[PDB]
């Protein structure tokens, strides 16, 4: 599952 961590969500 790449949704959470393939971008930095801040």
């Amino acid at each position: 599952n790449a949704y959470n961590m393939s971008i930095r969500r801040s």
Partner: antibody
Amino acid sequence: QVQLQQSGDELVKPGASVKLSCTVSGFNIKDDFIHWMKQRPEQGLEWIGRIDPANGYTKYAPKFQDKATMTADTSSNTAYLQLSSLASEDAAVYYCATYGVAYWGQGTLVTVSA
Amino acid sequence: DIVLTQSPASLAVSLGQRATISCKASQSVDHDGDSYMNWFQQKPGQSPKLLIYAASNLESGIPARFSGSGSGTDFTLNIHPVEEEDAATYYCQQTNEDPYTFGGGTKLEIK
């Protein structure tokens, strides 16, 4: 099951504008940012920016701030990229992506005539 | 901005052997114990395909022959073993800091 279907290739004239689309199926676009990328064979891959379709908020790379306008419509699950005042260096393949950056559209070729 | 430098720019590898591609970032791409480096594969006329996210996570649908390692500024993509279908250009991408940036690509050929 998620598909990002981008609009067809465009031949554009210098100084004109063009609006590209990215129609998403199998995914509620309110659920994530949509990202736009540019690719040229020499300058490679560049991130143009991302839009949050749930609120319309946009973030651009500084080099694209007065070239690109990202919009989206949750009503049609479609994101748009408007390119303004086209010039030779705008000829490129443009991609949209979402689900973080895991799922990409097939790309739209923009060619600029002489 | 973060500059990503890949090494080598191109390589030819014998079928069935291992290959490693390096991506070095000009500043750290770490945050809160994670490393926001992705690896993509691209073949001519196709969109980039995500292989690895957050340095070491294998994307669903990608063979376990691909693995990612590294943290901070230094990252590697390993292919073990290399197969014919791996002929492609590989890109690293950081998503730690805006604007996201990509490496210049590494073209892999089979011999």
